[PDB]
């Protein structure tokens, strides 16, 4: 928006750190069922919850 509130900026701060992939050693822990993040977002498709 470039004219943001503070609550709005925090919301984007959290959604922008959830985006990264899974650390590759996680795939090594004992009881795993996780391969790819599957909870990623891409600003062109699935716009934010706004």
């Amino acid at each position: 928006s470039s004219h943001k509130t503070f609550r709005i900026k925090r919301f984007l701060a959290k959604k922008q750190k959830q985006n990264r992939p899974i650390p590759q050693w996680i795939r090594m822990k004992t009881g795993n069922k996780i391969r790819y993040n599957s909870k990623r977002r891409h600003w062109r498709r699935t716009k934010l919850g706004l």
Partner: protein, 86 residues
């Protein structure tokens, strides 16, 4: 022109983030939430969509106080005492 042409002049928003719900439900013109009902003192639950009711009731959050109230009772609700030292 009621579609694909009017779906274009849609810049401004009716709802935003409610400070009590956390949902993108707060009506800005009306200044009430509309999922809990914000300036009203009581939450808008309903006996009238049980599926929406069980989406946010006790247990669906953290219960970060209630979850230890069940712990104390189970043992006796005592306080101001410490187990016997070594």
């Amino acid at each position: 022109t009621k579609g694909t042409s009017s779906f274009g002049k849609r810049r401004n928003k009716t709802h935003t983030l409610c400070r009590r719900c956390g949902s993108k439900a707060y009506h800005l013109q009306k200044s009430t939430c509309g999922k809990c009902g914000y300036p009203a003192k009581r939450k808008r639950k309903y006996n009238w969509s049980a599926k929406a009711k069980r989406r946010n009731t006790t247990g669906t959050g953290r219960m970060r106080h209630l979850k230890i109230v069940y712990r104390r009772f189970r043992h006796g609700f005592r306080e101001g005492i410490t187990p016997k030292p070594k």
